Amino acid sequence: VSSLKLRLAGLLASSNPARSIAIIEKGNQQVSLSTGDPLPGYDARIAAILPDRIIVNYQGRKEAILLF
């Protein structure tokens, strides 16, 4: 599984005017992120946001993030 210390707080479906929308909380602070924006904490890129898992290219590797 994924080794990143991140907890998924919400995962809604892709909105109409955007491609995807997912809420990620890190360090007790909640922030909204999309598909393509960089992570403010680590140098990781979010490849895609699936309805059942999260795909994040951390150090050139694919990690699966399951629901909390």
Binding site: G10, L12, A13, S15, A18, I21, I23
Partner: protein, 226 residues
């Protein structure tokens, strides 16, 4: 899918809003969270449906508008200057708040008001009940409440209100019978009940028949005696 775990009500509105694509103004003093696991997908109409239902559970209520989108109130009342009122063709659905009214036509509109202000005393700034000498019967409540209460009055008012019917008579005396009915079936140490659901009797001497008026399980007795 409505897969929200420990999600704060703020990020609930601020994220679900995003998905819905509608503007929304939150008011302060709104602090809390939900959590829920869902298995089936809800975007088409059941999205907004269940959204408003969830806001309804905590009792934090919202009103939606036409030009701009809905808002979140902390007063929870119809007093918000916004109350879309159904006209008996759109009952809506349990989630929304309306203000309905009906002219009750057969019954004193005072006494059902305590029982209904109790049965439906919504302690989240729910409806009220008032009487006007024009027998207006009004409330606001919720949209699901509408079903139960419409059904209430429609059943209780349709309970066999005043109807009239007569009986002729072959040969016996007229004024003498009724003159002798309110002595055999008049009263008891304690009234059978209030003035309704019990029939009164008069008669003319002209056609030699007698008059009754009352309820479909009261008059039958009178016809029995005659």
């Amino acid at each position: 899918s409505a897969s929200f775990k420990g999600t704060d009500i703020q990020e609930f509105i601020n994220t679900v809003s995003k998905n819905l694509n509608k503007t929304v103004i939150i008011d302060p003093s709104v602090r809390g969270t939900i959590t829920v696991r869902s298995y089936d997908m809800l975007n088409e109409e059941q999205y907004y449906q269940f959204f408003l239902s969830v806001l309804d559970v905590y009792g934090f209520a919202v009103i939606n508008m036409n030009n701009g989108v809905l808002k979140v109130v902390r007063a929870k009342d119809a007093k918000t200057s916004a109350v879309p009122v159904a006209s008996a063709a759109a009952p809506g659905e349990g989630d929304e708040v309306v203000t309905r009214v009906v002219p009750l036509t057969n019954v004193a509109a005072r006494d059902l008001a305590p029982l209904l202000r109790q049965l439906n005393d919504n302690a989240g700034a729910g409806s009220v009940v008032h009487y006007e000498p024009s027998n207006v019967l009004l409330m606001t409540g919720r949209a699901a409440v509408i079903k139960r209460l419409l059904t209430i009055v429609e059943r209780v008012d349709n309970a066999g209100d005043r109807s009239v019917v007569t009986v002729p008579l072959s040969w016996a005396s007229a004024a003498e019978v009724v003159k002798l009915v309110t002595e055999l079936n008049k009263d008891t140490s304690k009234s059978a009940l209030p003035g309704s659901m019990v029939a009164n009797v008069v008669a003319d001497e002209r056609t030699n028949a007698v008059l009754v008026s009352g309820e479909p399980n009261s008059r039958q007795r009178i016809i029995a005696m005659i």
